[PDB]
Symmetry: D2
Protein backbone atom coordinates (compact mmCIF):
# COMPACT_ATOMS: atom_id res chain seq x y z
CA UNK A 1 0.00 0.00 0.00
CA UNK A 2 2.20 2.88 -1.32
CA UNK A 3 -0.42 5.60 -0.82
CA UNK A 4 -2.56 5.96 2.28
CA UNK A 5 -4.82 8.84 3.29
CA UNK A 6 -5.71 9.52 6.90
CA UNK A 7 -8.22 12.19 7.77
CA UNK A 8 -8.99 13.56 11.24
CA UNK A 9 -11.77 15.74 12.54
CA UNK A 10 -10.41 18.58 14.71
CA UNK A 11 -13.89 19.55 15.87
CA UNK A 12 -14.89 16.21 17.30
CA UNK A 13 -11.38 14.78 17.84
CA UNK A 14 -12.10 11.68 15.86
CA UNK A 15 -11.15 9.92 12.70
CA UNK A 16 -12.94 11.63 9.85
CA UNK A 17 -15.13 8.73 8.79
CA UNK A 18 -16.69 8.15 5.35
CA UNK A 19 -14.88 11.06 3.73
CA UNK A 20 -14.64 10.70 -0.03
CA UNK A 21 -11.10 10.82 -1.36
CA UNK A 22 -10.37 10.97 -5.07
CA UNK A 23 -6.86 10.51 -6.34
CA UNK A 24 -5.82 11.84 -9.69
CA UNK A 25 -2.69 11.50 -11.75
CA UNK A 26 -1.62 14.38 -13.96
CA UNK A 27 -1.91 13.25 -17.57
CA UNK A 28 0.60 14.37 -20.24
CA UNK A 29 -1.98 16.99 -21.37
CA UNK A 30 -1.98 18.45 -17.82
CA UNK A 31 -5.50 17.22 -17.05
CA UNK A 32 -6.17 15.17 -13.94
CA UNK A 33 -7.01 11.54 -14.76
CA UNK A 34 -9.08 9.80 -12.07
CA UNK A 35 -6.74 7.19 -10.66
CA UNK A 36 -8.19 5.80 -7.44
CA UNK A 37 -10.82 6.76 -4.91
CA UNK A 38 -12.59 5.67 -1.76
CA UNK A 39 -14.15 6.59 1.56
CA UNK A 40 -12.11 6.83 4.73
CA UNK A 41 -12.75 3.94 7.16
CA UNK A 42 -13.91 4.17 10.75
CA UNK A 43 -10.32 4.92 11.69
CA UNK A 44 -10.34 7.78 9.13
CA UNK A 45 -7.94 5.86 6.92
CA UNK A 46 -8.10 5.04 3.25
CA UNK A 47 -5.86 2.11 2.31
CA UNK A 48 -5.46 0.12 -0.90
CA UNK A 49 -5.78 3.12 -3.21
CA UNK A 50 -3.01 1.95 -5.47
CA UNK A 51 -0.27 -0.65 -5.75
CA UNK A 52 3.46 -0.20 -6.09
CA UNK A 53 3.10 -1.37 -9.74
CA UNK A 54 0.44 1.25 -10.58
CA UNK A 55 1.84 4.11 -8.47
CA UNK A 56 4.54 5.34 -10.84
CA UNK A 57 6.39 8.64 -10.61
CA UNK A 58 4.24 11.60 -11.53
CA UNK A 59 2.21 14.43 -10.11
CA UNK A 60 -0.73 13.22 -8.08
CA UNK A 61 -3.66 15.01 -6.58
CA UNK A 62 -5.50 13.73 -3.52
CA UNK A 63 -8.88 15.36 -3.34
CA UNK A 64 -10.61 15.03 -0.02
CA UNK A 65 -14.26 15.85 -0.01
CA UNK A 66 -14.16 17.80 3.20
CA UNK A 67 -17.26 19.84 2.29
CA UNK A 68 -19.51 16.75 2.10
CA UNK A 69 -18.04 15.65 5.41
CA UNK A 70 -18.96 18.89 7.16
CA UNK A 71 -22.39 19.07 5.55
CA UNK A 72 -23.24 15.57 6.86
CA UNK A 73 -22.26 16.79 10.33
CA UNK A 74 -24.42 19.94 10.05
CA UNK A 75 -21.42 22.23 10.19
CA UNK A 76 -20.79 25.02 7.73
CA UNK A 77 -17.53 24.43 5.90
CA UNK A 78 -15.36 27.02 4.18
CA UNK A 79 -13.46 24.94 1.67
CA UNK A 80 -14.92 23.08 -1.27
CA UNK A 81 -12.43 20.28 -0.51
CA UNK A 82 -8.87 19.64 0.59
CA UNK A 83 -6.62 19.25 -2.44
CA UNK A 84 -3.19 17.66 -1.94
CA UNK A 85 -0.95 17.88 -4.97
CA UNK A 86 2.50 16.28 -4.96
CA UNK A 87 5.14 14.66 -7.12
CA UNK A 88 5.51 10.98 -6.33
CA UNK A 89 9.22 10.49 -6.90
CA UNK A 90 10.70 7.02 -7.16
CA UNK A 91 14.18 7.93 -5.89
CA UNK A 92 13.90 7.89 -2.07
CA UNK A 93 11.09 7.17 0.44
CA UNK A 94 8.02 5.77 -1.28
CA UNK A 95 5.14 4.92 1.11
CA UNK A 96 2.97 8.06 1.29
CA UNK A 97 0.62 8.82 4.12
CA UNK A 98 -1.38 11.90 3.35
CA UNK A 99 -2.64 13.08 6.70
CA UNK A 100 -5.37 15.69 6.71
CA UNK A 101 -6.71 17.35 9.79
CA UNK A 102 -10.02 18.97 9.19
CA UNK A 103 -11.76 21.93 10.71
CA UNK A 104 -14.71 23.80 9.17
CA UNK A 105 -12.58 26.81 8.27
CA UNK A 106 -9.15 25.21 8.23
CA UNK A 107 -7.32 22.15 7.25
CA UNK A 108 -3.83 20.97 7.23
CA UNK A 109 -2.27 18.24 5.30
CA UNK A 110 1.00 16.53 5.99
CA UNK A 111 2.88 13.89 4.07
CA UNK A 112 4.55 11.05 5.92
CA UNK A 113 6.93 9.67 3.36
CA UNK A 114 8.61 6.47 4.63
CA UNK A 115 10.46 3.30 3.46
Amino acid sequence: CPLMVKVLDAVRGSPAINVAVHVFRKAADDTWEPFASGKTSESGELHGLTTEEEFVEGIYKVEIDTKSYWKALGISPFHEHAEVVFTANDSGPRRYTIAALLSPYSYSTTAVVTN
Copy 2:
Protein backbone atom coordinates in the same frame (compact mmCIF):
# COMPACT_ATOMS: atom_id res chain seq x y z
CA UNK B 1 -9.58 44.48 -0.13
CA UNK B 2 -12.01 41.51 0.19
CA UNK B 3 -9.39 38.86 -0.51
CA UNK B 4 -6.07 38.78 1.27
CA UNK B 5 -3.59 35.91 1.36
CA UNK B 6 -1.11 35.56 4.18
CA UNK B 7 1.63 32.98 4.18
CA UNK B 8 3.85 32.02 7.06
CA UNK B 9 6.95 29.90 6.97
CA UNK B 10 6.81 27.38 9.88
CA UNK B 11 10.48 26.42 9.49
CA UNK B 12 11.86 29.94 9.83
CA UNK B 13 9.15 31.48 11.99
CA UNK B 14 8.88 34.25 9.47
CA UNK B 15 6.57 35.55 6.79
CA UNK B 16 6.80 33.56 3.58
CA UNK B 17 8.06 36.31 1.27
CA UNK B 18 7.77 36.53 -2.56
CA UNK B 19 5.36 33.55 -2.63
CA UNK B 20 3.53 33.49 -5.93
CA UNK B 21 -0.26 33.34 -5.45
CA UNK B 22 -2.73 32.72 -8.29
CA UNK B 23 -6.46 33.16 -7.89
CA UNK B 24 -9.00 31.47 -10.16
CA UNK B 25 -12.78 31.63 -10.30
CA UNK B 26 -14.83 28.71 -11.56
CA UNK B 27 -16.64 29.81 -14.74
CA UNK B 28 -20.21 29.04 -15.87
CA UNK B 29 -18.69 26.17 -17.89
CA UNK B 30 -16.82 24.71 -14.89
CA UNK B 31 -13.27 25.63 -15.96
CA UNK B 32 -10.97 27.77 -13.81
CA UNK B 33 -10.73 31.28 -15.11
CA UNK B 34 -7.68 33.34 -14.05
CA UNK B 35 -8.99 35.86 -11.55
CA UNK B 36 -5.95 37.55 -9.97
CA UNK B 37 -2.40 36.81 -8.98
CA UNK B 38 0.39 38.27 -6.95
CA UNK B 39 3.42 37.80 -4.72
CA UNK B 40 3.33 37.94 -0.95
CA UNK B 41 5.14 40.96 0.39
CA UNK B 42 7.80 41.20 3.10
CA UNK B 43 5.06 40.69 5.65
CA UNK B 44 4.07 37.47 3.83
CA UNK B 45 0.86 39.19 2.85
CA UNK B 46 -0.76 39.68 -0.47
CA UNK B 47 -3.14 42.57 -0.65
CA UNK B 48 -4.90 44.19 -3.60
CA UNK B 49 -5.77 40.99 -5.42
CA UNK B 50 -9.27 42.14 -6.17
CA UNK B 51 -12.03 44.56 -5.30
CA UNK B 52 -15.52 44.44 -3.78
CA UNK B 53 -17.00 45.00 -7.28
CA UNK B 54 -14.87 42.31 -8.95
CA UNK B 55 -15.01 39.73 -6.17
CA UNK B 56 -18.49 38.50 -7.01
CA UNK B 57 -20.07 35.28 -5.74
CA UNK B 58 -18.38 32.19 -7.04
CA UNK B 59 -16.06 29.33 -6.38
CA UNK B 60 -12.50 30.56 -6.15
CA UNK B 61 -9.24 28.74 -6.08
CA UNK B 62 -6.17 30.28 -4.48
CA UNK B 63 -3.03 28.43 -5.58
CA UNK B 64 -0.07 29.26 -3.43
CA UNK B 65 3.20 28.47 -5.12
CA UNK B 66 4.68 26.82 -2.08
CA UNK B 67 7.01 24.65 -4.20
CA UNK B 68 9.02 27.53 -5.73
CA UNK B 69 9.10 29.05 -2.25
CA UNK B 70 10.83 26.00 -0.71
CA UNK B 71 12.94 25.33 -3.80
CA UNK B 72 14.55 28.77 -3.66
CA UNK B 73 15.47 27.91 -0.05
CA UNK B 74 17.17 24.66 -1.22
CA UNK B 75 14.31 22.57 0.14
CA UNK B 76 12.53 20.01 -2.03
CA UNK B 77 9.06 20.26 -0.60
CA UNK B 78 6.34 17.62 -0.68
CA UNK B 79 3.46 19.59 -2.23
CA UNK B 80 3.40 21.22 -5.67
CA UNK B 81 1.34 24.03 -4.20
CA UNK B 82 -1.19 24.79 -1.52
CA UNK B 83 -4.57 25.35 -3.09
CA UNK B 84 -7.61 26.61 -1.21
CA UNK B 85 -10.94 26.25 -2.99
CA UNK B 86 -13.99 27.96 -1.60
CA UNK B 87 -17.34 29.42 -2.34
CA UNK B 88 -17.06 33.14 -1.78
CA UNK B 89 -19.82 35.66 -1.00
CA UNK B 90 -22.65 33.07 -0.92
CA UNK B 91 -24.46 34.98 1.88
CA UNK B 92 -23.40 38.44 0.64
CA UNK B 93 -19.95 40.08 0.34
CA UNK B 94 -17.26 39.06 2.82
CA UNK B 95 -13.60 39.78 3.50
CA UNK B 96 -11.50 36.63 3.16
CA UNK B 97 -8.11 36.13 4.68
CA UNK B 98 -6.55 32.98 3.35
CA UNK B 99 -3.93 32.21 5.97
CA UNK B 100 -1.43 29.53 5.11
CA UNK B 101 1.35 28.11 7.21
CA UNK B 102 4.03 26.26 5.31
CA UNK B 103 6.41 23.48 6.17
CA UNK B 104 8.29 21.46 3.58
CA UNK B 105 5.99 18.46 4.05
CA UNK B 106 2.92 20.11 5.51
CA UNK B 107 0.80 23.11 5.09
CA UNK B 108 -2.28 24.32 6.74
CA UNK B 109 -4.75 26.77 5.42
CA UNK B 110 -7.21 28.75 7.46
CA UNK B 111 -9.92 31.11 6.39
CA UNK B 112 -10.75 34.25 8.30
CA UNK B 113 -14.11 35.38 7.00
CA UNK B 114 -15.38 38.67 8.30
CA UNK B 115 -18.41 40.75 7.51
CA UNK B 116 -17.59 44.34 6.66
Copy 3:
Protein backbone atom coordinates in the same frame (compact mmCIF):
# COMPACT_ATOMS: atom_id res chain seq x y z
CA UNK C 1 5.13 45.77 21.12
CA UNK C 2 7.64 42.84 21.11
CA UNK C 3 5.08 40.21 22.09
CA UNK C 4 1.76 39.87 20.33
CA UNK C 5 -0.65 36.95 20.55
CA UNK C 6 -3.11 36.24 17.77
CA UNK C 7 -5.79 33.62 18.05
CA UNK C 8 -7.99 32.31 15.29
CA UNK C 9 -11.03 30.14 15.60
CA UNK C 10 -10.83 27.34 12.98
CA UNK C 11 -14.47 26.33 13.46
CA UNK C 12 -15.94 29.76 12.76
CA UNK C 13 -13.26 31.13 10.45
CA UNK C 14 -13.06 34.15 12.67
CA UNK C 15 -10.79 35.78 15.19
CA UNK C 16 -10.98 34.14 18.59
CA UNK C 17 -12.30 37.08 20.61
CA UNK C 18 -12.02 37.71 24.40
CA UNK C 19 -9.55 34.81 24.77
CA UNK C 20 -7.71 35.13 28.06
CA UNK C 21 -3.92 35.02 27.59
CA UNK C 22 -1.44 34.77 30.48
CA UNK C 23 2.28 35.25 30.03
CA UNK C 24 4.85 33.87 32.46
CA UNK C 25 8.63 34.12 32.57
CA UNK C 26 10.74 31.40 34.13
CA UNK C 27 12.52 32.88 37.17
CA UNK C 28 16.11 32.32 38.38
CA UNK C 29 14.66 29.63 40.69
CA UNK C 30 12.82 27.82 37.85
CA UNK C 31 9.26 28.76 38.83
CA UNK C 32 6.91 30.61 36.47
CA UNK C 33 6.58 34.23 37.40
CA UNK C 34 3.48 36.10 36.13
CA UNK C 35 4.73 38.37 33.38
CA UNK C 36 1.66 39.81 31.64
CA UNK C 37 -1.87 38.89 30.73
CA UNK C 38 -4.69 40.07 28.57
CA UNK C 39 -7.71 39.30 26.40
CA UNK C 40 -7.62 39.04 22.64
CA UNK C 41 -9.49 41.87 20.99
CA UNK C 42 -12.16 41.75 18.27
CA UNK C 43 -9.40 41.05 15.78
CA UNK C 44 -8.34 38.06 17.93
CA UNK C 45 -5.17 39.94 18.73
CA UNK C 46 -3.57 40.82 21.98
CA UNK C 47 -1.25 43.77 21.85
CA UNK C 48 0.45 45.72 24.61
CA UNK C 49 1.40 42.75 26.76
CA UNK C 50 4.88 44.07 27.38
CA UNK C 51 7.58 46.45 26.25
CA UNK C 52 11.06 46.25 24.75
CA UNK C 53 12.53 47.20 28.17
CA UNK C 54 10.47 44.66 30.12
CA UNK C 55 10.66 41.80 27.62
CA UNK C 56 14.17 40.75 28.58
CA UNK C 57 15.84 37.46 27.65
CA UNK C 58 14.21 34.48 29.26
CA UNK C 59 11.97 31.51 28.91
CA UNK C 60 8.38 32.62 28.56
CA UNK C 61 5.16 30.73 28.68
CA UNK C 62 2.06 32.03 26.94
CA UNK C 63 -1.04 30.22 28.23
CA UNK C 64 -4.01 30.75 26.00
CA UNK C 65 -7.26 30.06 27.77
CA UNK C 66 -8.70 28.07 24.92
CA UNK C 67 -10.98 26.08 27.26
CA UNK C 68 -13.07 29.06 28.48
CA UNK C 69 -13.17 30.20 24.86
CA UNK C 70 -14.83 26.97 23.65
CA UNK C 71 -16.93 26.58 26.80
CA UNK C 72 -18.62 29.94 26.31
CA UNK C 73 -19.51 28.69 22.81
CA UNK C 74 -21.14 25.54 24.31
CA UNK C 75 -18.23 23.38 23.17
CA UNK C 76 -16.39 21.11 25.59
CA UNK C 77 -12.92 21.29 24.14
CA UNK C 78 -10.14 18.74 24.49
CA UNK C 79 -7.31 20.92 25.83
CA UNK C 80 -7.30 22.90 29.07
CA UNK C 81 -5.30 25.60 27.32
CA UNK C 82 -2.79 26.13 24.57
CA UNK C 83 0.58 26.94 26.07
CA UNK C 84 3.59 28.07 24.06
CA UNK C 85 6.93 27.98 25.87
CA UNK C 86 9.93 29.60 24.30
CA UNK C 87 13.25 31.21 24.88
CA UNK C 88 12.89 34.84 23.94
CA UNK C 89 15.58 37.33 22.90
CA UNK C 90 18.47 34.82 23.09
CA UNK C 91 20.24 36.46 20.10
CA UNK C 92 19.10 40.01 20.97
CA UNK C 93 15.61 41.59 21.10
CA UNK C 94 12.95 40.26 18.75
CA UNK C 95 9.27 40.81 17.99
CA UNK C 96 7.24 37.66 18.67
CA UNK C 97 3.87 36.93 17.21
CA UNK C 98 2.39 33.89 18.87
CA UNK C 99 -0.22 32.80 16.35
CA UNK C 100 -2.65 30.16 17.48
CA UNK C 101 -5.40 28.46 15.55
CA UNK C 102 -8.03 26.76 17.63
CA UNK C 103 -10.34 23.85 17.07
CA UNK C 104 -12.18 22.07 19.86
CA UNK C 105 -9.80 19.09 19.70
CA UNK C 106 -6.77 20.65 18.07
CA UNK C 107 -4.72 23.72 18.17
CA UNK C 108 -1.67 24.84 16.40
CA UNK C 109 0.74 27.47 17.45
CA UNK C 110 3.15 29.28 15.22
CA UNK C 111 5.80 31.80 16.03
CA UNK C 112 6.56 34.74 13.81
CA UNK C 113 9.89 36.09 14.97
CA UNK C 114 11.08 39.25 13.34
CA UNK C 115 14.07 41.47 13.90
CA UNK C 116 13.16 45.11 14.38
Copy 4:
Protein backbone atom coordinates in the same frame (compact mmCIF):
# COMPACT_ATOMS: atom_id res chain seq x y z
CA CYS D 1 -3.38 1.30 25.64
CA PRO D 2 -5.65 4.25 26.66
CA LEU D 3 -3.09 6.96 25.87
CA MET D 4 -0.96 7.05 22.75
CA VAL D 5 1.23 9.86 21.45
CA LYS D 6 2.11 10.18 17.79
CA VAL D 7 4.55 12.81 16.63
CA LEU D 8 5.30 13.83 13.04
CA ASP D 9 8.03 15.93 11.52
CA ALA D 10 6.60 18.48 9.06
CA VAL D 11 10.06 19.41 7.81
CA ARG D 12 11.14 15.97 6.73
CA GLY D 13 7.66 14.41 6.35
CA SER D 14 8.46 11.55 8.63
CA PRO D 15 7.55 10.11 11.97
CA ALA D 16 9.29 12.14 14.62
CA ILE D 17 11.55 9.42 15.98
CA ASN D 18 13.12 9.25 19.46
CA VAL D 19 11.24 12.27 20.77
CA ALA D 20 11.00 12.29 24.54
CA VAL D 21 7.45 12.47 25.85
CA HIS D 22 6.71 12.99 29.53
CA VAL D 23 3.22 12.57 30.84
CA PHE D 24 2.14 14.22 34.04
CA ARG D 25 -0.98 14.02 36.13
CA LYS D 26 -2.12 17.10 38.02
CA ALA D 27 -1.81 16.36 41.74
CA ALA D 28 -4.34 17.68 44.28
CA ASP D 29 -1.83 20.47 45.12
CA ASP D 30 -1.86 21.55 41.44
CA THR D 31 1.69 20.33 40.80
CA TRP D 32 2.40 17.98 37.92
CA GLU D 33 3.33 14.48 39.11
CA PRO D 34 5.45 12.51 36.61
CA PHE D 35 3.17 9.72 35.49
CA ALA D 36 4.66 8.04 32.42
CA SER D 37 7.27 8.79 29.81
CA GLY D 38 9.07 7.42 26.78
CA LYS D 39 10.61 8.03 23.39
CA THR D 40 8.57 7.89 20.21
CA SER D 41 9.28 4.78 18.10
CA GLU D 42 10.44 4.65 14.50
CA SER D 43 6.83 5.22 13.49
CA GLY D 44 6.78 8.33 15.74
CA GLU D 45 4.43 6.59 18.14
CA LEU D 46 4.60 6.16 21.88
CA HIS D 47 2.43 3.30 23.12
CA GLY D 48 2.07 1.65 26.52
CA LEU D 49 2.32 4.88 28.51
CA THR D 50 -0.43 3.88 30.88
CA THR D 51 -3.10 1.26 31.43
CA GLU D 52 -6.84 1.66 31.73
CA GLU D 53 -6.46 0.88 35.48
CA GLU D 54 -3.86 3.63 36.03
CA PHE D 55 -5.33 6.22 33.64
CA VAL D 56 -8.06 7.63 35.87
CA GLU D 57 -9.99 10.84 35.31
CA GLY D 58 -7.91 13.93 35.91
CA ILE D 59 -5.95 16.65 34.20
CA TYR D 60 -2.97 15.31 32.30
CA LYS D 61 -0.09 16.99 30.62
CA VAL D 62 1.78 15.45 27.71
CA GLU D 63 5.13 17.13 27.36
CA ILE D 64 6.87 16.50 24.09
CA ASP D 65 10.50 17.40 23.98
CA THR D 66 10.36 19.00 20.59
CA LYS D 67 13.40 21.20 21.27
CA SER D 68 15.73 18.21 21.79
CA TYR D 69 14.28 16.73 18.61
CA TRP D 70 15.13 19.79 16.53
CA LYS D 71 18.55 20.21 18.11
CA ALA D 72 19.49 16.62 17.17
CA LEU D 73 18.48 17.45 13.59
CA GLY D 74 20.57 20.66 13.54
CA ILE D 75 17.52 22.85 13.17
CA SER D 76 16.82 25.87 15.32
CA PRO D 77 13.57 25.39 17.21
CA PHE D 78 11.34 28.10 18.65
CA HIS D 79 9.48 26.24 21.37
CA GLU D 80 10.98 24.74 24.48
CA HIS D 81 8.56 21.81 24.02
CA ALA D 82 5.02 20.98 23.00
CA GLU D 83 2.78 20.85 26.06
CA VAL D 84 -0.61 19.14 25.73
CA VAL D 85 -2.86 19.62 28.72
CA PHE D 86 -6.27 17.95 28.88
CA THR D 87 -8.88 16.50 31.21
CA ALA D 88 -9.16 12.75 30.80
CA ASN D 89 -12.86 12.23 31.43
CA ASP D 90 -14.26 8.77 32.04
CA SER D 91 -17.76 9.46 30.69
CA GLY D 92 -17.47 9.03 26.90
CA PRO D 93 -14.64 8.12 24.47
CA ARG D 94 -11.54 6.98 26.33
CA ARG D 95 -8.64 5.96 24.03
CA TYR D 96 -6.54 9.11 23.52
CA THR D 97 -4.20 9.63 20.63
CA ILE D 98 -2.28 12.82 21.06
CA ALA D 99 -1.04 13.67 17.61
CA ALA D 100 1.62 16.33 17.33
CA LEU D 101 2.92 17.69 14.09
CA LEU D 102 6.20 19.44 14.51
CA SER D 103 7.87 22.27 12.69
CA PRO D 104 10.77 24.35 14.02
CA TYR D 105 8.56 27.39 14.61
CA SER D 106 5.17 25.73 14.82
CA TYR D 107 3.42 22.74 16.11
CA SER D 108 -0.05 21.48 16.26
CA THR D 109 -1.55 18.93 18.47
CA THR D 110 -4.77 17.09 17.96
CA ALA D 111 -6.58 14.62 20.15
CA VAL D 112 -8.18 11.56 18.61
CA VAL D 113 -10.53 10.39 21.30
CA THR D 114 -12.13 7.05 20.37
CA ASN D 115 -13.92 3.97 21.87
